[PDB]
């Protein structure tokens, strides 16, 4: 693209006309040139640090050294955006000067001095100088962005290139986690990018003040010195409000972050909460957090109703100070219209820099902080500079104190080696040091297999799963060969995981997705090492982490056959010593040092063996549903009328300003300008407050409705709709309709209403401007239409690109040692350079579409400058300066009307998402009985009779149960189990009225269970699900939040199950804070909670579900506790997954394929009778 078209961005016009017909994929906005690559700018930045580190005798990359490196690498493009910025501003100054000339040669009637003695000629050299203000400004806007975006590119790389060299010690990685370094990439790097977006402004704005002082002084005098003083002495109090805002905004963010964790506990555990009638309790727990978040957002709203106010009010008071002082104090050269209507444009220019100068110096401070943060990061610990270890002294402390010394390990090729020892014997540490991740104080680790290192498979003890498909987490960027994959899937039993998944092999696994079971997470990680065909496999306790027992057998039987056939050496540390003297050339270490090394028989001969023997639609419906529904007329009409009346005062302040300059009735000129500008200032306050106030009153009554109509939803909705869908619209859309909409609402409602106002001023000054504006408005309409359609697409394509980049900066940090273990640095390196260049190429075209709008809209506005000038002069020879000082603003109103309109449109779409949630409601609470007199004090008879109940979920073709009849009498503790995919889970949940028994009758305790309120039913019948999680809170509160029974009862209930020793000897006791997920009590504690809920509710019935995978001793203890629970209750209808605990029953119903297969009234005849014994064996 040449200089004729690069300055107007003509190449966008073929990109925005296609973006209207089709949408924009990444294949549409695809190519990214050589100069704007992440790699190229990274090569430039390496050259900068190399040439510095050649030049600098003083070594390290301190904050001084980074800024010298950035300057030497990016100076030649920053000077071209500050030179163009100084010229765009200085040519901008000519615009006020021309207004002065036009009005002087209007009214009361060498050749070049007379050439600029005109008003026809002076408009043309005004018009053909604004085309240079408005093209140089954009050229320097874009060069700043293009250079700024490049720093995003070559700092995210140069951050990531140290993530490839960071040491995973308990010092370094223990201090800074992935959350610290992710907000370096996310939060910090953006505010260093944004410093180079604003880097010319701190150079240019001091020129603007100096010339702004000088030209205003030449136009009006020493009174201009008094006037421009009042702005520059209200710029630091613009800073104080902008400081106190960001102080309060951090508070609001760190407060609603704690809310979102509470909301995550409610949405993730809505299943167990709804069954235990505990949705209302957690609802009122998040609402009080919303009360405290609302008083924090109120302080945000107070300190942002001043920022708008200070921006508008401070210049107007400054202008009135200038003129009234130039009238009251001394009027020598009074306000002739050439002077006054020209120095309004000089202030209307210097409105903008001085109150944006506060927020530049803000973003210079943040840049100083950011290179402090980045240099303190970028001086972290480097890593370093078959396996045979000779001396083997190696530490995690970077000076002294080896955690493993005297390590003389020998592992020649063609091998299979187990490593066993005590929990804490330097065993996991030996493998990571062997891989080359710990500092060899003495010795060496040598190598020659199939200086010079080797790619080695690795399984971490804490398993790591990248956010991808489970197949893709298994394949791990390796060529898919479905025969190797098939063997892996069966061996680790990935078939039940795929079937239980919503998607199977396509399921989003790991983090940010399905938070799988810890054994299931371990099975995924274990399989990747086997699949990868790496030349050596190091497994760090897969068998000690192996949850599935037969698969643990099968793992070893697959790992033997895989190691022997591949002849891939395998070092498998574990302290499960089942295979340990058989055929492993074992290497046992103790207390950090190797204790014995040799063959297995040698360890039989060393007497430690005995120890082993032991898409184009605007949304006016959502905007109407936002304002008129939530806010109410009592402040919707006040906001809509104060906007118009503030915006009729701004023409009335200007219309009377014109009609005084003609006279240049003097104290009446003063007493209406003071009494218009003061009420103009007053209306500024009461529109800036009323906008932000309406935002708070709509944010509250949206979120309160959203919570209290999603805690009124069936659980079938929670299984049908994903919990990421509800939580995203919950969390992110509430942030937009609180923190982002009302400021945009006030800014758009100020700008576009002023835009019509400015085009009203022009059309009455030249009252045949209607002919002039009708063709030009149409072009303004079309650029509006093709910009919204375009820059919505590139907006979400910006935002949905940033998230896979920062998720890569999480997944690199957490599973770091895997990537360095496979010697796999350069293949997660290149995934960054695709992720980086997918973000910059969707941010460059976002800004190039932004600049295309501004170049095109300003040229529309510059046509308004020449036409308003030309038609008004030819009228006024037959209020012209005031009309002409508005035409300059119109070029910079049409921009921001369109810019806010697109942004408001994008933000408005976050209200339609919330109203789509507010139309999803079911699962009524009605009791069609005598609702307090027909139920007695407690239904706890235990007589749960089923009469042909036909129940289902799919509601269309698929029932689960049919024709079922079962009448467990009071005390008939009838543990009913049937076919494993048929109906068992459905049976337990449906009993709590949570599934559609489409016929029949299911009576419980003499009352129909379909004709009771859900709150009454669910409270009065306890349960215990398969393997639930814990709500974070106080221990009595977690056990029973709305208890009101007794504290002694809570102790008796907690002791009666288990863990009373750990409950009493906890550091908290009865108010012990559950540490965010139940990582310190038990799985038994859920049964304890169920026992406490059962006893406190004073019921007899209980429906109890299965148990997933735990200590069977604890499960027999649970079964004995269930017997103890029986020896209080004596009635329980308890399903079970493994039938061997269910063989101690009092009646048994066996269900096959989704029907009743057997109903054995004793449980011992079941062993005699063939169908039931076949399920028993």
């Amino acid at each position: 693209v040449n200089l004729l078209s690069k300055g107007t961005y003509w190449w966008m016009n073929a990109f925005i006309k296609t973006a209207h017909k089709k949408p924009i994929d990444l294949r549409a906005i695809a190519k990214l040139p050589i100069a704007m690559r992440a790699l190229t700018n990274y090569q430039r930045l390496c050259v900068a640090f190399d040439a510095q580190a050649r030049k600098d005798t003083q070594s390290p990359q301190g904050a001084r050294a980074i800024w010298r490196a950035l300057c030497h690498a990016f100076g030649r493009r920053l000077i071209l955006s500050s030179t163009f910025r100084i010229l765009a501003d200085l040519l901008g100054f000519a615009g006020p000067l021309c207004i002065f000339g036009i009005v002087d040669h209007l009214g009361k009637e060498v050749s070049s001095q007379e050439f600029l003695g005109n008003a026809y000629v002076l408009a043309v050299l005004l018009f053909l100088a604004l085309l240079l203000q408005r093209t140089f400004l954009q050229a320097s806007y874009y060069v700043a962005i293009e250079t700024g975006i490049n720093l995003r590119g070559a700092i995210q790389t140069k951050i990531y290139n140290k993530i490839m060299h960071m040491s995973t010690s308990n010092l370094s990685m223990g201090e800074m986690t992935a959350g610290q370094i992710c907000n370096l990439v996310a939060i910090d790097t953006n505010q260093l990018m944004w410093f180079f977006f604003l880097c010319p402004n701190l150079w240019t704005m001091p020129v603007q003040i100096i010339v702004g002082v000088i030209l205003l002084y030449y136009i009006l005098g020493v009174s201009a010195l008094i006037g421009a003083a009042v702005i520059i002495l209200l710029a630091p109090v613009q800073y104080f409000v902008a400081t106190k805002l960001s102080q309060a905004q951090r508070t609001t963010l760190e407060h609603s972050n704690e809310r979102l964790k509470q909301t995550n506990e409610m949405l993730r555990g809505m299943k167990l909460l709804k069954l235990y009638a505990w949705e209302s309790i957690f609802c009122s727990r998040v609402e009080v957090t919303r009360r405290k978040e609302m008083t924090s957002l109120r302080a945000f709203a107070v300190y942002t109703s001043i920022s708008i106010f200070m921006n508008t009010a401070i210049p107007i008071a400054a202008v009135l100070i200038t003129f009234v002082g130039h009238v009251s104090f001394f009027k020598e050269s009074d306000l002739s219209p050439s002077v006054a209507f020209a120095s309004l444009s000089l202030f209307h220019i210097l409105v903008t820099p001085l109150f944006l100068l506060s927020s530049v110096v803000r973003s210079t401070v943040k840049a100083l902080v950011s290179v402090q943060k980045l240099s303190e990061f970028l001086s972290s610990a480097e890593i370093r500079e078959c396996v045979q270890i000779i001396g083997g002294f190696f530490t995690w402390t970077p000076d002294g104190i080896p955690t493993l010394s005297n390590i003389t390990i020998r592992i020649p090729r063609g091998q299979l080696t187990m490593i066993v020892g005590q929990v804490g014997c330097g065993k996991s540490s030996l493998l990571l040091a062997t891989l080359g991740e710990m500092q060899k104080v003495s010795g060496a680790v040598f190598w020659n297999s199939n200086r010079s290192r080797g790619p080695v498979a690795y399984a971490s003890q804490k398993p790591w799963l990248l956010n991808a498909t489970v197949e893709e987490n298994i394949t791990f960027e390796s060529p898919f060969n479905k025969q190797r994959y098939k063997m892996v899937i069966e061996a680790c039993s990935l078939q039940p995981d795929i079937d239980i998944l919503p998607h199977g092999d396509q399921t989003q696994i790991g983090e940010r997705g399905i938070n799988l079971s810890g054994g299931q997470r371990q099975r995924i990680s274990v399989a990747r090492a086997l699949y990868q065909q790496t030349n050596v496999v190091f497994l760090d306790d897969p068998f000690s982490a192996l949850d599935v027992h037969l698969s643990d057998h099968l793992m070893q039987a697959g790992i033997l056959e895989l190691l022997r056939d591949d002849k891939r050496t395998v070092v498998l540390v574990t302290h499960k010593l089942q295979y340990l003297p058989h055929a492993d050339w074992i290497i046992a270490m103790k207390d950090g040092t190797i204790q014995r090394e040799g063959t297995l028989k040698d360890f039989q001969r060393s007497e430690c063996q005995l120890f082993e023997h032991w898409q184009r639609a605007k949304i006016p419906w959502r905007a109407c549903t936002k304002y008129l529904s939530s806010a109410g007329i009592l402040l919707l009409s006040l906001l809509v009328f104060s906007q118009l009346l503030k915006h009729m005062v701004l023409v009335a302040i200007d219309y009377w300003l014109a009609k005084w300059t003609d006279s240049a009735d003097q104290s009446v000129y003063a007493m209406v300008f003071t009494l218009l500008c003061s009420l103009g200032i007053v209306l500024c306050l009461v529109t800036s407050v009323t906008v932000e106030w309406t935002g708070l009153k709509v944010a509250k009554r949206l979120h309160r409705s959203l919570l209290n109509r999603i805690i009124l939803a069936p659980m079938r909705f929670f299984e049908t709709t994903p919990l990421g869908s509800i939580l995203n619209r919950f969390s992110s859309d509430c942030n937009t309709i609180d923190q982002h909409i009302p400021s945009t609402l006030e800014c758009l409602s100020r700008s576009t209403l002023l835009c019509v106002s400015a085009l009203t001023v022009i059309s009455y000054v030249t009252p045949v401007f209607l002919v002039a504006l009708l063709p030009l408005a149409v072009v303004c309409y079309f650029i509006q239409k093709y910009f919204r359609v375009a820059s919505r697409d590139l907006q979400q394509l910006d935002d949905t690109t940033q998230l896979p980049l920062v998720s890569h900066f999480a997944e690199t940090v957490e599973g770091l040692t895997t990537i360095r273990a496979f010697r796999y640095e350069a293949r997660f390196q290149q995934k960054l350079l695709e992720y980086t260049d997918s973000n910059n190429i969707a941010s460059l075209f976002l800004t190039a579409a932004n600049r295309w709008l501004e170049v095109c809209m300003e040229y529309i506005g510059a046509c308004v400058v020449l036409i308003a000038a030309a038609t008004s002069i030819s009228n006024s020879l037959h209020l012209v300066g005031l009309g002409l000082t508005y035409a300059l603003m119109v070029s910079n109103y049409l921009n921001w009307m369109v810019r806010n309109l697109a942004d408001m449109e994008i933000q408005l779409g976050a209200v339609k998402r919330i109203h789509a949630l507010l139309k999803t409601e079911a699962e009524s609470y009605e009791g069609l009985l005598a609702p307090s007199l027909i139920p007695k004090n407690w239904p706890d008879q235990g007589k749960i009779q089923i009469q042909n109940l036909s129940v289902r979920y799919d509601s269309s073709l698929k029932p689960v149960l049919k024709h079922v009849n079962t009448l467990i009498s009071p005390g008939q503790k009838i543990g009913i189990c049937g076919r494993t995919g048929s109906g068992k889970s459905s049976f337990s949940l449906a009993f709590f009225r949570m599934v559609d028994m489409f016929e029949g009758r299911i009576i419980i305790d003499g009352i129909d269970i379909a004709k009771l309120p859900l709150h009454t039913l669910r409270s009065r019948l306890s349960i215990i699900l398969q393997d639930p999680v814990l709500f974070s809170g106080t221990i009595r509160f977690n056990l029973d939040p709305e208890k009101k029974c007794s504290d002694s009862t809570l102790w008796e209930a907690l002791e009666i199950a288990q863990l009373k020793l750990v409950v009493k000897a906890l550091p908290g006791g009865l108010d012990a804070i559950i540490t965010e997920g139940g990582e310190n009590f038990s799985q038994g504690q859920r049964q304890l909670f169920c026992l406490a809920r059962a006893f406190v509710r004073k019921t007899s019935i209980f429906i109890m579900d299965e148990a997933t995978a735990s200590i069977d001793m604890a499960t027999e203890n649970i079964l004995q506790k269930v017997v103890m629970t029986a020896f209080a209750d004596r009635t329980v209808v308890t399903i079970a997954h493994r039938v061997h605990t269910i063989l101690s029953a009092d009646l048994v119903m066996v269900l096959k394929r989704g029907a009743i297969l057997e109903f054995d009234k004793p449980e011992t005849l079941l062993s005699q009778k063939d169908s039931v014994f076949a399920s028993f064996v």
């Binding site: 953006n190 805002l245 960001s246 905004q249 989003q508 990421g724 945009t744 800014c747 109103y893 921001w896």
Partner: peptide, 19 residues
């Protein structure tokens, strides 16, 4: 900047996977 999409951004926000 009469319109406010200004350079005072809170950069960090968390959004889970769509659908």
């Amino acid at each position: 900047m009469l319109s406010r999409k200004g350079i005072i951004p809170e950069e960090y926000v968390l959004t889970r996977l769509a659908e």
